[PDB]
Design a protein around this ligand. Structure first.
Ligand SMILES: N#Cc1cnn2c3cc(nc12)N1C[C@H](C[C@H]1CO)OC/C=C/COc1cc(cc2c1NC(=O)CC2)N3
Ligand SMILES: N#Cc1cnn2c3cc(nc12)N1C[C@H](C[C@H]1CO)OC/C=C/COc1cc(cc2c1NC(=O)CC2)N3
Ligand SMILES: [Cl-]
Ligand SMILES: [Cl-]
Lengths: 123, 123
């Protein structure tokens, strides 16, 4: 529309959301993945994940301070996807591909799942 | 770096943050601007504004649920900048330019201030 577009604004916001997370500022949830914990902002989690969207949009689960992921979710894969959520950068490699794809399916991250598929299809 | 770049991810996150705001989901602050109120997410406000960054990063003001802006801040200009924060789209026109620039200066939004300046310089 008529409005002036700032092509760098969305990435600048995300960069500052990542800094808040690295500074533990206004984080409101702890995600427990086996023997590891990850603090995050529910608004970001919802924005990036069908699983977290379906949890927090429900008034019954909205005020939860702790989420325990299913015991078979690997912390490595969760960490890679949480970083992705806050950076737009996906660290796919040969040693993590299966763990990441499986974690993205669980988190309901369709674009990441399809990218994990293009990766297997390539080289 | 080595990581896969998702060029649409940052704008998709922002779009979903705007939907949360339009759905009054996980908003944690009310900004009072004269006879008007605006609900928002403190994390977004901090990410876009030097004024809100300096408020909420301070442990003494972090848990505030209401912010009353100075009585001379016009609600029109604040509304335009809040929409910008959540969309990357800036609605600058002839009838609002002065109000928007003055509000951006108060909110400490340097890129918007400099853009308001390029606008006066142009046409
Ligand atoms: N307000 C708000 C809000 C905050 N996060 N968020 C997301 C989607 C969303 N709104 C929000 N939608 C999508 C659509 C219309 C609108 C409803 O408000 O509803 C259907 C729900 C779909 C669930 O699946 C996702 C939800 C979100 C993000 C992804 C997926 N699924 C992926 O495979 C990767 C990305 N986040
Ligand atoms: N964590 C976190 C976090 C959340 N929001 N946010 C912002 C900047 C920021 N970190 C955060 N910085 C900037 C720098 C290093 C780092 C310190 O963490 O510190 C100096 C402070 C500057 C204040 O001015 C701004 C602050 C933010 C955004 C803008 C301005 N000033 C503008 O004129 C338009 C944009 N948001
Ligand atoms: Cl995705
Ligand atoms: Cl700015």
């Amino acid at each position: 529309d008529s409005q002036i577009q700032f092509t760098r604004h969305a990435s600048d916001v995300l960069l500052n959301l990542n800094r808040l997370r690295s500074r533990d500022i206004l984080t409101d949830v702890v995600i427990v993945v086996s023997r590891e914990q990850f603090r995050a902002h529910k608004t970001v989690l919802m924005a990036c994940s069908g699983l977290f969207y379906s949890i927090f949009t429900d008034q019954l689960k909205r005020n939860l301070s702790v989420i325990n992921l299913d015991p078979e979710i690997n912390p490595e894969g969760f960490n890679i996807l949480l970083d992705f959520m806050y950076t737009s950068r996906l660290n796919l490699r040969e040693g993590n591909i299966m763990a990441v794809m499986a974690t993205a399916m669980y988190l309901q991250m369709e674009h990441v799942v399809d990218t994990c598929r293009k990766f297997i299809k390539a080289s």
